[PDB]
Amino acid sequence: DFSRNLYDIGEQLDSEDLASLKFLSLDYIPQRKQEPIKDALMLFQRLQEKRMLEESNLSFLKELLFRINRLDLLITYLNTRKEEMERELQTPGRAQISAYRVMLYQISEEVSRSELRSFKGGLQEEISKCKLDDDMNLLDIFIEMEKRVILGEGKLDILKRVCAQINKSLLKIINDYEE
Amino acid sequence: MDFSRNLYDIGEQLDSEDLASLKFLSLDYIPQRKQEPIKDALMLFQRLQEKRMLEESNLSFLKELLFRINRLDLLITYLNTRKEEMERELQTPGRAQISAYRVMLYQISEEVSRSELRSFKGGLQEEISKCKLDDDMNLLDIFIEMEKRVILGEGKLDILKRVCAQINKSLLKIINDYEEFS
Amino acid sequence: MDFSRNLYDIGEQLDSEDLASLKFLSLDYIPQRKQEPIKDALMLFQRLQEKRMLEESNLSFLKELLFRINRLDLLITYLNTRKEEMERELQTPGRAQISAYRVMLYQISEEVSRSELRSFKGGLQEEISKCKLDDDMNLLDIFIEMEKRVILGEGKLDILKRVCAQINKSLLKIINDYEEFSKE
Amino acid sequence: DFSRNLYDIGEQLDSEDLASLKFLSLDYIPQRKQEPIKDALMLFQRLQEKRMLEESNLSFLKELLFRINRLDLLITYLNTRKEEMERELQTPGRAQISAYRVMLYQISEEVSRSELRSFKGGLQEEISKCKLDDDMNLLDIFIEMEKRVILGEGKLDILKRVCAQINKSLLKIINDYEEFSKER
Amino acid sequence: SHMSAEVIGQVEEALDTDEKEMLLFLCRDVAPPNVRDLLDILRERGKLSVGDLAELLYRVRRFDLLKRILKMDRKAVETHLLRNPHLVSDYRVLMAEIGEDLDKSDVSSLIFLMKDYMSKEKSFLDLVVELEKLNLVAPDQLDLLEKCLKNIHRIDLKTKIQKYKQSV
Amino acid sequence: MSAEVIGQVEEALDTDEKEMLLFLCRDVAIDVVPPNVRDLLDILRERGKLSVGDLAELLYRVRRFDLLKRILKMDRKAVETHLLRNPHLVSDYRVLMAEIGEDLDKSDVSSLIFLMKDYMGRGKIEKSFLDLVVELEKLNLVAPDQLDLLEKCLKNIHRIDLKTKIQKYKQSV
Amino acid sequence: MSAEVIGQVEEALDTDEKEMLLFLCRDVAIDVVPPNVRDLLDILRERGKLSVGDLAELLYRVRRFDLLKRILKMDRKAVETHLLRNPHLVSDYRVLMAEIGEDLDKSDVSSLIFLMKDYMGRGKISKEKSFLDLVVELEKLNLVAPDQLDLLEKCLKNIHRIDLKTKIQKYKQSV
Amino acid sequence: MSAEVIGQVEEALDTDEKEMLLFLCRDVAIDVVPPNVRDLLDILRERGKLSVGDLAELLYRVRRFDLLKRILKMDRKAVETHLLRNPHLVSDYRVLMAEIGEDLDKSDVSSLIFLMKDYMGRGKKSFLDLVVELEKLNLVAPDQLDLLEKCLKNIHRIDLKTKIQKYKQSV
Amino acid sequence: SAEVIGQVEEALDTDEKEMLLFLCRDVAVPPNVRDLLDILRERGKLSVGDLAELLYRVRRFDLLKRILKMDRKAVETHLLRNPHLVSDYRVLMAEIGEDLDKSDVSSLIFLMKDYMGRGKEKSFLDLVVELEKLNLVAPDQLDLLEKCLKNIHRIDLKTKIQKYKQSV
Amino acid sequence: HMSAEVIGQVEEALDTDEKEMLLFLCRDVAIDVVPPNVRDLLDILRERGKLSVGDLAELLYRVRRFDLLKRILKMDRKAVETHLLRNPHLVSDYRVLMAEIGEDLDKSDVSSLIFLMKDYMGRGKISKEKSFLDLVVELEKLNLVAPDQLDLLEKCLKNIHRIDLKTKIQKYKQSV
């Protein structure tokens, strides 16, 4: 049962997983349709409307779950191992989440709370006309930066400047992406 | 017996740490999406009632939960149940509803102190992301994360053993006793 | 005097240690879920007021609490009550609302020093999980944990006696005086 | 610049200075507010909130620095000499720190560590063991005795008995204070 | 004691929107665009005595209106229901009862499961009517609804269905 | 009573005060359920029940003494005098229910609903205490002369102070 | 094609999708103002603007590829082939406006409407209305057009949506 | 011009714009009450009252600059130039009423209708409907605006009261 | 002149023309306003005062000023000084109809349906005309109307009727 | 007279505390209405003819945002202070005083104040954090604090040992 399996997968994803999944889908689901998505099922329904998810096409859902490190869900509900995922996503042209989006997600995955406060302060420095919200996570900050075109595939100067002021492993994730 | 009043009284004696333990011991019955808004015991009980795992004529799961978090005071005061009865019931094959694996993880977390928790987090630096190894994470949250990455499971105990053996051998006995029981 | 201002002033003279003691002595009336967020005396007083155990015309429980944590300064300055009045009042049959058992445990905690607290925790290693013997736990927290496991109670003093007798014989004297007084 | 002066003064005061200042301010800053004070600047803020410290009113801060013998800070930051303070504080009614509080502080300055141990031994039956632990200094002990109303302006008997068993100079401090307070 | 247009007008002005929708749902087998027309049609066909109207008010749980408008209490209505045949079937009562025990998140989950066999603000009663129109649910055809309720972990509501089936 | 004054009052009240006002007038306009406060005051005015004294009573009951002073040019004493010497639009029972509601916080209301829903045959439904009272009234479970169930449930969530308020109302009756 | 297929399409779209559909066809049906999507699709059919490929274009523009397959039995390959080989019912200007609208959340749209009230009466446009509603009001006032996007660019800049200004500039460069 | 443009205009306007157009011409077609816009435009045409300049004025007052451009190939500047140099079909009073109407949000209009209910019955909507009702009662007129000013001040629209005061000065 | 008749007929809207026909029903029934005014003229009953009373009763004070060059106060003085063309009963019905909104009229028609059936949306004056044709309301027979106004909670309209009754 | 653009720049530059302060400071200007946020407030001031450049300059001065004065309005401290010396103030000295007091009270102090005042106020149980400005508004609704009625507030500030804040009140009364 396809719909039931989607429902069960959705029952195992909380608000934080959902925020991550929404960020990783940003290039296919725009902000107006992102806003009312409060549970994973609504995200899945939007993906079904684009035919990016159907009984015969599980690739994007598998890639999403892999990128947020839900290997438990991959094996339990989609009969898929980490190694199959790795070899599939290393085949050129098969990954549907861009390397840039994944890179940003991995940065946000290694920034702690205090490091988030340093990030927010440095970016408020770059944004001297708008007081940022205080509840923002790093993914929200990335979205705000993209809106101002101070962050993008061809613009990592401010990201690098801020990350270098915080931790060298962040600059490493960035440089590996560039390579 | 006023059933709702009794559930309310029980809930008034359970604080946020006991609740976190109860939610962890219920992970195999209440999934993460439904766990997230549970902020007091009454919300937990309402979910169990919807699964028909808790009603006036069916107190077994609630008794097992309170037994496993060592709230014997509540068992005797509000459920007229002594430790020896619980041991006899739960040692009967097929009667326990919380898996031995789940209980085993909770008991490990009961034996790990704060400094040992820091060492545990240090051991997982290569398998878990930093934001999930942050200071605002207890051992049960770490276990949930390890399960999500399939580096911990009913049949994958290698990493748990490797990390525990670098902290205390009593943890390894809990693991090994579980393995012998299974 | 103004009742609310007097309660506020009393509350300003109680630090976090006094509050921990007052919350412990109130355990039989304020359950654990409601104990957790109490961070200042005023929140404790609000709990007692909702049960009508503290009101402008009923200061008895507040006086008993302050007497049992040895804040005789606050009793006389803010409540015009001397030690001898409290002794007469609490020796009247039926009048004390804090059980002798709860007071007895509080008095044990007043006689156990920092190193003795570490030794006490060492004595409980087979009965309490290691995380509930952590260095930040005070003795009252330990008693609460023992009560939850029903290895400590009005008629369950064997483990308390064992550990205290390894700590100091004066502790055993406090226990034994309570045990003899309580059978009344 | 007032705020900077307060900051600089606070930067020159160590943890022993701070423990003394908190004790000498006991009658003006209650226990709940004493607990989180870990630097002199926070004590100065509490004094400012009570209007006992401002640019036009330095007298309490001067009296504090005089009584804890930081004459260097008095002259360097507050333009005040020892002799000016002695002249001001020698007429009855000018001191904002009571003669009783000063007398207790002077006892603690005259008691050595070994004498402190003897003091704790002398109080075995009046104070609980936890308040006589190795971490307690004499000022904390005095505070505990005041909470139990076994020490105060009109209760010097236990203080005298204990000091008499230790050193006659301690008893002299007490007796000079008493005779002077009886002059009016 | 007598049915009149005044009584119908009082009832219709006092019910709120949710109660009016429930009432229209409960009367689908005795059949209207709104409650006033429904009650007028029932009256005209001889199916709105005081007791029939009391049954309807009892089923939407407006006991205040029972007492204030019809001067009847709970026991009188239960007596009437034991003595007389029911205007509203036990199947309809069960559907409304299940609907009242589902919150909006539950209904969204149920709709997601059931869309494969057949629009985001639809109540449970709206979904039931669409399922009736599609021959997917009926008083004697409850297995699909029961399965979907089980699959969203509402075992309590599956049990309500089972007790209904045992009552038949 | 003009429309200008009704409009001033309605625009000045906040959401909670407007909900209270609708609750307090349930026995005056018992037949109809007014959707908002302006329609409620208009209905009262048309029925001859919104004189200056009636409006002053309503503003007094929602504790908007600033509006009493600014719009009607009265102080509390004058409204209290008017209330001592005229029949009240809002009964002591409604005042009591609103007072209990202000003394309950959201955690209290959750506990109370958990206990009372067994007696309501309530569905799975954040509601204020006044919403709960309305639901109980529709079920004939609470009334000026029927407070035992509510008193029992307040007692059972350890609001002995509120149980005492109910007992004092019963004694005044 | 048939009335049944039109009915299926109309039943399957939600309110936002129907409003977008009406907006996207404002240049096709200009001598009549269709009151709803059923009337719009009927008019487009009568005028020869609703072949299967035309309807597929409309469904593609509202991103309902599930409906493309279920109702018209097509995928993106065939729809893109049709769009390469045929004139488009919906201009690139209309597509751009819809794309901007789908990248604006409720707060951004609110800020935009507030900025546009310096150019129109407060009663023209309600606070909760969509970006496409605002665009319609601006078109009626001749304040936005395929060759007149400067005011829109200024407003998007003022709410710090430089990404959307960049989309507009890319559109202009395509011309 | 021909009646085909009349049909184009009638087809392109929405219901609110049609109601406004009927309101704006109440002093031109004073001896009749047109039931709909077509009839209004037919009556205006017949009376020599619907030249290109007249229609441009009307479309400008209902703010259909898109139709101005598509039908008459005119923009704002051209119509304003025409209005500076020719007599107006629509009086400054009607223009003022419509401009006040379009600066009023829904809550404002509701509050105004409620305030006016003190001057008329319950059975008797937009701001322009209210103005028509007040005109029928001789409660508002080009030289009788105090009641309207009072109501606008009571709903705190001082900007709109000021617009009325500017109109009064212009007279 | 006769041209004033055309002006008046063109200036009134549909509801006002209906009220005008209703108000003149007691004069010795014309299908439209032009025929009514022509008949009044033929009988010598369309003086300045007659027409002013008619325009005042349909509340077209703008037409009073524009056509007859007079104001509300002049007509009110004339009506205090002279016999009325339109009876107080007709005025009472029209005034009641003017204080009822659509919801009130729907409820009144629904209540009346028990007495008059469906009849031939429908205004209050239409309902009154249908009731008059069935002899259910008359200047001396207002109890049913009073009862219906009471049941829709318009006690003010009932007391207006009562003050009319006491004036007679 | 101010553009939506300028209102937007102000609103986007302010933080939560400054926005709440601005709403409180304007309670006498727009007394009859409860604006839900700062943009609505400023548009309401436009409709009332109370948002000239000087009015906005005064508002920005009262929330101490001289950066916004410079960037948005091209004014400095001296220009707004001269304007305030020569023109009636939107914001009374009483509201400035209340905001100044609230700046120096933390949440613990405000919960203490409420505990002392709740019996005077007939207040219920509200388990939600309140700023001092929230409490002032509650007291204003009860006619318990006003420009000419500060004795109760003064006494309660004394009772929580904030003699410094009571002294601010005394200086206000002497200035008046």
Swiss-Prot record, chain A:
Residues 1-179 form a propeptide. Belongs to the peptidase C14A family. The chain holds residues 2 to 180 of 479 of the full protein. Isoform 1, isoform 5 and isoform 7 are expressed in a wide variety of tissues. Highest expression in peripheral blood leukocytes, spleen, thymus and liver. Barely detectable in brain, testis and skeletal muscle. Heterotetramer that consists of two anti-parallel arranged heterodimers, each one formed by a 18 kDa (p18) and a 10 kDa (p10) subunit. Component of the death-induced signaling complex (DISC) composed of cell surface receptor FAS/CD95 or TNFRSF1A, adapter protein FADD and the CASP8 protease; recruitment of CASP8 to the complex is required for processing of CASP8 into the p18 and p10 subunits. Component of the AIM2 PANoptosome complex, a multiprotein complex that drives inflammatory cell death (PANoptosis). Interacts with CFLAR and PEA15. Interacts with TNFAIP8L2. Interacts with CASP8AP2. (Microbial infection) Interacts with human cytomegalovirus/HHV-5 protein vICA/UL36; this interaction inhibits CASP8 activation. Residues 1-79, 99-176 form the DED domain. This is Caspase-8. Changing D72A: Abolishes binding to FLASH. Induces NF-kappa-B activation. It is found in: Cytoplasm; Nucleus; Cell projection, Lamellipodium. The catalytic domain is sufficient for recruitment to lamellipodia but catalytic activity is not necessary. It comes from the Eukaryota.
UniProtKB/Swiss-Prot annotation, chain B:
Generation of the p10 and p18 subunits requires association with the death-inducing signaling complex (DISC), whereas additional processing is likely due to the autocatalytic activity of the activated protease. GZMB and CASP10 can be involved in these processing events. (Microbial infection) ADP-riboxanation by C.violaceum CopC blocks CASP8 processing, preventing CASP8 activation and ability to mediate extrinsic apoptosis. Isoform 1, isoform 5 and isoform 7 are expressed in a wide variety of tissues. Highest expression in peripheral blood leukocytes, spleen, thymus and liver. Barely detectable in brain, testis and skeletal muscle. Residues 1-182 form a propeptide. It is found in: Cytoplasm; Nucleus; Cell projection, Lamellipodium. It comes from the Eukaryota. Residues 2-80, 100-177 form the DED domain. It is linked to Caspase-8 deficiency: Disorder resembling autoimmune lymphoproliferative syndrome (ALPS). It is characterized by lymphadenopathy, splenomegaly, and defective CD95-induced apoptosis of peripheral blood lymphocytes (PBLs). It leads to defects in activation of T-lymphocytes, B-lymphocytes, and natural killer cells leading to immunodeficiency characterized by recurrent sinopulmonary and herpes simplex virus infections and poor responses to immunization. Belongs to the peptidase C14A family. This is Caspase-8. It comes from Homo sapiens. The chain holds residues 1 to 182 of 479 of the full protein.
UniProtKB/Swiss-Prot annotation, chain D:
Isoform 1, isoform 5 and isoform 7 are expressed in a wide variety of tissues. Highest expression in peripheral blood leukocytes, spleen, thymus and liver. Barely detectable in brain, testis and skeletal muscle. Residues 1-184 form a propeptide. Generation of the p10 and p18 subunits requires association with the death-inducing signaling complex (DISC), whereas additional processing is likely due to the autocatalytic activity of the activated protease. GZMB and CASP10 can be involved in these processing events. (Microbial infection) ADP-riboxanation by C.violaceum CopC blocks CASP8 processing, preventing CASP8 activation and ability to mediate extrinsic apoptosis. It is found in: Cytoplasm; Nucleus; Cell projection, Lamellipodium. Residues 1-79, 99-176 form the DED domain. It comes from the Eukaryota. Belongs to the peptidase C14A family. The catalytic domain is sufficient for recruitment to lamellipodia but catalytic activity is not necessary. This is Caspase-8. It comes from Homo sapiens (Human). The gene is CASP8. The chain holds residues 2 to 185 of 479 of the full protein.
UniProtKB/Swiss-Prot annotation, chain G:
It comes from the Eukaryota. Residues 1-73, 92-170 form the DED domain. Residues 1-175 are annotated as: Interaction with FADD. Residues 1-175 are annotated as: Interaction with CASP8. This is CASP8 and FADD-like apoptosis regulator subunit p43. It comes from Homo sapiens. The gene is CFLAR. The chain holds residues 1 to 175 of 480 of the full protein.
